[model samples]
Target chain A: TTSAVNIYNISAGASVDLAAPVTTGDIVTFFSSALNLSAGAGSPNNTALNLLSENGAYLLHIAFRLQENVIVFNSRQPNAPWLVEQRVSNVANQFIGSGGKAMVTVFDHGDKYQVVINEKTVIQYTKQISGTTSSLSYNSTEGTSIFSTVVEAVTYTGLA
Target chain B: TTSAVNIYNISAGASVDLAAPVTTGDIVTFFSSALNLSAGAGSPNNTALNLLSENGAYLLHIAFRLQENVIVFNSRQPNAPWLVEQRVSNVANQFIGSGGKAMVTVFDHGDKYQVVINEKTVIQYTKQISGTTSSLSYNSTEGTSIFSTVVEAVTYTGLA
Candidate 1:
């Protein structure tokens, strides 16, 4: 006898960014349903990330993925300084360049990541974190840039 | 209580083509409410006009102000065959190109068009009809390259 496998459906809440200067390793959970990602390129190894609310409804996220492990940053707030830094591997480098758009959900159980570009899906990854490293330093040696934005909530999952 | 200006409050639509094979006089409209304008490098006879959408959207808009009313040929598509000719006199021209990580919208609207390299806006214009006898020609005599994604919507009174 053959049996069929069933996949479970999950519904998640959306999170909003109410303050600025959020650092890396902060787990952003959505309060509404999802987080949107967008970006563009200026030069080789130089890209811009424009984070938005799901469906162009809000401006809640911002980060630029320059290359494999390097990221340049931006926040929704005006006059905020751009920050650049390197994220540790296994943290799942969120792709945020000109062609990568993503929607992510973080809940009590785990975190799920979905990326799209020009209304098309490109990449997806999931992770469980105990605690994330938060910092605001741009390594001049790395030649990376970072920007900041205010986020509504950051979840402490208590998993690494 | 203080009132803050909500720039994203207003909703409008501008039309643009994602792919090509357009004809002349086909007007295109952008699904946007407002447009940004600026000045270009001034030339005694050949002034340049550059246009962009707001909010980190690619697809730049460009137009060249000719000094002597140059007639240029319109190609069927990007790197396609030239099929028609039209006379463009000191007017704005709008088109789209792929650059960096997003689509760039370029236009030459009046003195200078806005530069919204990574912004959102619907831009529309149309291609020149073929077999027309005017200052513009499809043959190499006028020029070699043809503009792709020619706008279809030219004029609009209300918000797009």
Candidate 2:
């Protein structure tokens, strides 16, 4: 499809979702030229990107915190967020959570979640997400997500 | 939320579906760097990335063929076009399948369709597709099938 250059500002509290619904066995990639936000004071910093359950009852969010200097790769199921990579040391408040470093999340049905940043995989956890979920959404915590970037969502024919 | 460079060129018939009813409970992945498509001295190479139903119905597809030195990952769907990876490669034409430098197929759902290429033990393969299916249109032996390269895809909160 054709579209104008998407400048995903994603103001504070605002979010951006791709028109596509990420099904099982899909690999979603999120790239940012600007990830200017603070990982708020919560366990899961301000939201950077997320994958919610089909019911929306819970969500696996990648919270980017510039203050605490850490990018959290966790999920919110019951009362708190499950830790995937909550203590990633982002000293000097690098763009480790945003533009400077790209992030890729690969979901293998009920097997695992492979997370890649800066073109390298950093986490491959086995705690899979709900099977019936679909869709792609971007988020904001208290910072400007990007001045320029892309939200790529691919739906394959179940093949490689 | 933002990307500095996004030059989406799916060609005309080469369409990408992000909002086109990608089914639920289904696994999906889109890869080309690994999808070694070779034209093999034929008209429009018969190799490509495809999707099949448990019963083997032709769904979405991306056909890739390196014919005359230009790689093409085209599709068989009526409205779907093909993609020209553009790069060129020619060696002994290795059929790296099942074993020997295995390929990775990333899943995005809640089933067992996690087809891992080289490294093993990602899923039990319950949702494993009919990997042996023939042709993009369910055609038997003399039809087009995608093979001999790499597999890649993405997964997201699907909500963002």
Candidate 3:
């Protein structure tokens, strides 16, 4: 549509970083499947999908806490990382499977934002976060199977 | 990515018509979480998603057959429709649930196609059909709680 849409895909075992594909007042959808999940607490140790700001302070992350066996969705903006939903256990193990699928849609409603994962509403907050999705990557250091990725965007519609 | 994509969303009691929005060499993803399922199979016929051609010669329909307690994915080119995966009882009873979610993704691989629903692989055929989608509609002429509807399109990668 007139709305912005971007798709960044990588074959099995390739990492990539993209410039901010979204701006303020724009809704964005982030999706990635088949990610490498290492079992450690170091860099690239537990992060599956990472979107960070210029200094890496404010950010969003979709992590597969293998040890805990939970699909962790988190976001931080100067404040401590906010846990959007930590009980994606139903599909947590699937993240390590051959073709695991995970999708995060941020419905930017101007004064607020609604986040949904796999068709389930996770969180709703009126934060000034996600306004600048400058850079993103999947399993930053390791490579994984991601034959498809769709980052569709649309304009925000906050309360009038 | 020149393929055209259009979304036709209607409320529970209303009906609508839309011109076809896709051509060959394009894939489409049709999703309707909750749908209107009437007891009778008359006008509206209990089909929540339908893609039909002008003069109604060819058609593809996604229905939540409540009475049978099964989700039906079928298509027709000349006459009575045929099933892509008949009696897909896998996710049968989930449709009538309060906030049930169902999605059908038709990956148009030019010479072939792949269709999946509710994370279930329903059909994969190389038939020379369903190439040109002119229009679409939601739970037209019925009562249903449809949280969201997405008729997204993507460039097709047909088998060479």
Every candidate's lDDT: 0.24, 0.38, 0.44
Model 1 segments more than 4 A misplaced: A1-122, A125-160, B1-65, B69-73, B76-82, B86-160
Q: Give the C-alpha lDDT of model 3.
A: 0.44
Tens-place lDDT per residue, model 3, A77-141, is 65565645434563343433234445555544444545555445555544435455555555532
- How does the DockQ of candidate 2 come out? 0.03
For candidate 3, the TM-score is 0.39
lDDT tens per residue, model 3, B14-39: 33455444443334455455444444
* Cα lDDT over the full model 1: 0.24
The CAPRI classification for model 3 reads as: incorrect
Chain A (alone) TM-scores for all candidate structures: 0.22, 0.61, 0.51
Model 2 segments beyond 4 Å from truth? A1-21, A35-46, A78-86, A91-103, A144-157, B1-160
Highest-scoring model, TM-score: 2
Q: What would the per-residue lDDT of candidate 2 be over residues A52-143, giving only the tens digit for each residue?
A: 66556234566656556666666655455555444456533333434443444455444556555533455555553455334345665333
* Candidate 1 TM-score, true structure as reference: 0.23
Query: Model 1's CAPRI class?
Result: incorrect
Weakest lDDT window of 10 consecutive positions for candidate 3 chain B: B151-160
Prediction 2 global C-alpha lDDT:
0.38
